[PDB]
């Protein structure tokens, strides 16, 4: 539930199994990595 797939579009920091919702530049759609 709270955990999300690897490259799933997450919402904020943590809230995922990879626990890092970093974004690769000047764009939206933060994803877990």
């Amino acid at each position: 539930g709270d955990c999300l797939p690897h490259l799933k579009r997450c919402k904020a920091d943590n809230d995922c199994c990879g626990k890092k919702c970093k974004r690769r530049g000047t764009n939206a759609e933060k994803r877990c990595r």
Partner: protein, 49 residues
């Protein structure tokens, strides 16, 4: 240029308005190369990513 317009412009140390021209060059570099060009590059790279 990669370092602002001041690279091609003559040194204002020996002339008047030295501080004004230095501030102008610094703000031009900051607002063009550091910000706008980086934003464009980030847009393209993040679109590819």
């Amino acid at each position: 240029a990669g370092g602002g317009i001041g690279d091609e412009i003559e040194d204002p140390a020996g002339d008047e308005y030295e501080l004004y021209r230095v501030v102008f060059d610094i703000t031009f570099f900051f607002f063009v190369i550091v910000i706008l060009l980086a934003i464009i590059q980030g847009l393209i790279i993040d679109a590819f990513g």
